[PDB]
Amino acid sequence: GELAQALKELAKALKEEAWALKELAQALKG
Amino acid sequence: GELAQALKELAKALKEEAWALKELAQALKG
Amino acid sequence: GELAQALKELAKALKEEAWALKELAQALKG
Amino acid sequence: GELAQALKELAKALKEEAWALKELAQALKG
Amino acid sequence: GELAQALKELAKALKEEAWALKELAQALKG
Amino acid sequence: GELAQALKELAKALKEEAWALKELAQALKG
DSSP, rough: HHHHHHHHHHHHHHHHHHHHHHHHHHOOOO | HHHHHHHHHHHHHEEEEEEEHHHHHHTOOO | OHHHHHHHHHHHHHHHHHHHHHHHHHHHHH | OOOHHHHHHHHHHHHHHHHHHHHHHHHHHH | HHHHHOOOHHHHHHHHHHHHHHHHHHHOOO | HHHHHHHHHHHHHHHHHHHHHHHHHHTTTT
């Protein structure tokens, strides 16, 4: 239902945020 | 109640944050 | 209730942060 | 209760985040 | 119990993020 | 619960963002 769906969407977004943070860290190192 | 809605908004905002981190990473590369 | 509203406020803050970091990216890129 | 106190802490942190985002926007605008 | 603790952790981390946005703002000014 | 879990994960992500942004701040000063 609605809450389960929203929690799954938040979990996807957290994964995207972590991936993006790694891209920034890489760019900073470069 | 409104918990699921709040989590949907939070997931959407976190996606926007992730995209900004990706844009910063690319900006450091020109 | 109050929990959901505070999470909506947290989402609004991360949305604002995303926007400001996107502007920072545009300024760094030049 | 503990939840109410925690929401209070999050509200304080939101207010600090908001002022720092204002400062970042001020640094960017100029 | 665990939700109030998670919210307190989230407040702490938002304050760290505010500190970092201030540092960005200052760095933009040299 | 699942919610406390996800919010702890978000706090960790905001702490990592704060670290990266402080490194960006130093990079913006050369």
